[PDB]
Structure formats: C-alpha cells, structure tokens
Structure 1
Amino acid sequence: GAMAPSYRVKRMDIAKNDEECVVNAANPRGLPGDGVCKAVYKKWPESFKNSATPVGTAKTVMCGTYPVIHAVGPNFSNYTESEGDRELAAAYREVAKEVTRLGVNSVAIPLLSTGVYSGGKDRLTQSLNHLFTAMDSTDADVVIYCRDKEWEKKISEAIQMRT
C-alpha cells in the first residue's frame, strides 16, 4: 500500500504515466479503438492478447511485468442512462479488485465513459464519483489522467473538496 494513499490529477497522455500499472478505457472486443484506448494500444500492444471482456468488467493483461487493466465502461449511445450508470459503477468496482489483487502501490486511471462512450454528454462528475466509490477503500496512490485544462481544474477541485 501507499504510506498515505492519495488522489491526484494530471493533464497529459496516460501512456506516459509514472504509476505501477495503468487502467485502459477498453472496448469489449480488445480492439485498438479510439482516444485513450489507441494510446494504450500504441504503448502496450502486447497487453491486447485476449483482452476482450464484457461491459462492466476489467481484465488485466501483462505487458512484460507492467499490468494493463482493461476496464470496459458502457457506451451511453447504446445503454439507457439507468443501465449505463449501473455498468459504469461496476467497471470501476472491478478495477478496484484488480488493483488490490496486483498489490501495486499506484495506478494511472482515465475517467471511463467520458470520451467516445459519453453519448455526447459531460459525465465528469458521474464517472469521477463512481471512481471514488470504487477506489476509496484501496490504499494505492490513484493518479487520474485527463486531457482538458477545465476538466483538470474540476477534477482537482473535487479531490481537494474531500480534503
């Protein structure tokens, strides 16, 4: 565990993270995909061997000894708000189980379902609160990766608000 488990946010490519493992915003079929998923495919392509997994689940594949936790959030184009919310919460609970099982002291994580799976809605708060619900009981240092300066400010504010 981390000596004083923390949350942090950084505005940069999660493929350049300084953590002991990464969470991919995966698609269910293990395809190279778009956005975060494509950056993860480019950096850790070996981790896409048998990475396909259902919506609401996480499957870890090693790249060398570096764990890639493929977490499949719902595409809010396809899911109802209600069902999508349930699956988005579930994907984060499976991420917490994987981070715990791996024994890492740190994890790089994107906000699931906030990009091409957002259904064109702003899901910063929805996605971040499900991240917190899942990860608060873990003792890993969590570093959230985002690309927008205003999302960085909002994520940083939400972290600092809880102390």
Structure 2
Amino acid sequence: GAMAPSYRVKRMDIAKNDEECVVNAANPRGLPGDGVCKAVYKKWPESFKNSATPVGTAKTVMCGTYPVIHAVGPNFSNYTESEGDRELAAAYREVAKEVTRLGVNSVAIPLLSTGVYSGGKDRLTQSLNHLFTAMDSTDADVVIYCRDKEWEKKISEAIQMRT
C-alpha cells in the first residue's frame, strides 16, 4: 500500500504516467479505438491480446511486467441514463478489485465514459464520484489524468473539497 494514500490530478497523456499500472478507457472488443484507448494501444500494444471484456467489467493484461487494466464504461448513446449510471459504477468497482489483486502502490486512471462514450453530456462529476466510491477503500495512490484545462481545475477542486 501507499504510506499515505492520496488522490492527485494531472493534465497530460496517460501514456506518460509515473504510476505502477494504468487503466485503459477500453472498448468491449479489445480494439485500438480512439482518444485514451489509442494512446494506450500505441504505448502498450502487447496488452491488447485477449483484452475484450463486457461493459461494466475490467480485464488486466500484462505488457512485460506492467499491468494494463482494460475498463469498459458504457456508451451513453446506447444505454439509458439509469442503466448507463449502473454500468459506469460497476466498471470502477471492477477496477478497484484489479488494483487490489495486483498489489500495486499507485494507479493512473482516466474518467470513464466522459469522451466519445458521454452521449454528448458533461459527466465529470458523475464519473469522478463513481471513481471515488470504488477507489476510497483501496490504499493505492490514485493519479487521475485529463486533457482539458477547466476539467483539471474542477477535478482538483473536488479532491481538495474532501480535504
């Protein structure tokens, strides 16, 4: 475990993370995809061997000894708000199980279902609150990765609010 488990936020490419493992915002089919998923495919292509997994699940594949946790959030274009919210919560619960099983002291994580799976909505708060519900009982240092300057400020605010 980390000595004093923390949350932090950085605005940069998650493929350049300084943590012991990474969470991919994956598609259910294990395809290279777009956005975070394409960056992850370029950096750790070996981790996409048999990485397909259903919505609301996470599947870990090792790239050498470096764990890539493929977490599949719902596409809100297809899910109802209600069913999408349940699947997004579930995906983060499966990430917490994998992070615990691996024994890592730190993890890099993006905000699931906030990009091309957002159904054209702002889901910063919804996605971040499900991340906290899952990861609060783990003792890994969590580093959240984002690309937008205003999102960085809001995520930082939300972390600081809990102290």
Deviation of residue 84 (structure 1)? 0.2
1:127 — aligned with what?
127
1:72-102 C-alpha deviation (Å, 9 max, x unpaired): 0000000000000000000000000000000
Whole-Å Cα distance in 2 between the matches of residues 15 and 56 of structure 1?
23
CA RMSD across the alignment: 0.2
Whole-Å Cα distance in 1 between the matches of residues 116 and 81 of structure 2?
16
Whole-Å Cα distance in 1 between the matches of residues 37 and 83 of structure 2?
23
1:3-44 C-alpha deviation (Å, 9 max, x unpaired): 000000000000000000000000000000010000000000
Deviation of residue 155 (structure 1)? 0.1
Whole-Å Cα distance in 2 between the matches of residues 45 and 123 of structure 1?
28
Specify the SS of the correspondent of 2:108: strand
Whole-Å Cα distance in 1 between the matches of residues 74 and 152 of structure 2?
23
Q: Mind listing any 5+ residue stretches in structure 2 that lack a counterpart? A: none
1:93-127 C-alpha deviation (Å, 9 max, x unpaired): 00000000000000000000000000000000000
Whole-Å Cα distance in 2 between the matches of residues 42 and 151 of structure 1?
25
Answer yes or no: is 1:162 the counterpart of 2:162.
Answer: yes
Deviation of residue 156 (structure 1)? 0.1
Deviation of residue 142 (structure 1)? 0.0
Deviation of residue 134 (structure 1)? 0.1
1:95 — aligned with what?
95
Specify the SS of the correspondent of 2:144: strand
Runs (4+) of structure 1 exceeding 6 A deviation are: none
Q: What is the TM-score when the length of structure 2 is the normalising length?
A: 1.00
Whole-Å Cα distance in 2 between the matches of residues 147 and 99 of structure 1?
23
Identity %: 100
Specify the SS of the correspondent of 1:23: strand
Whole-Å Cα distance in 2 between the matches of residues 131 and 88 of structure 1?
9
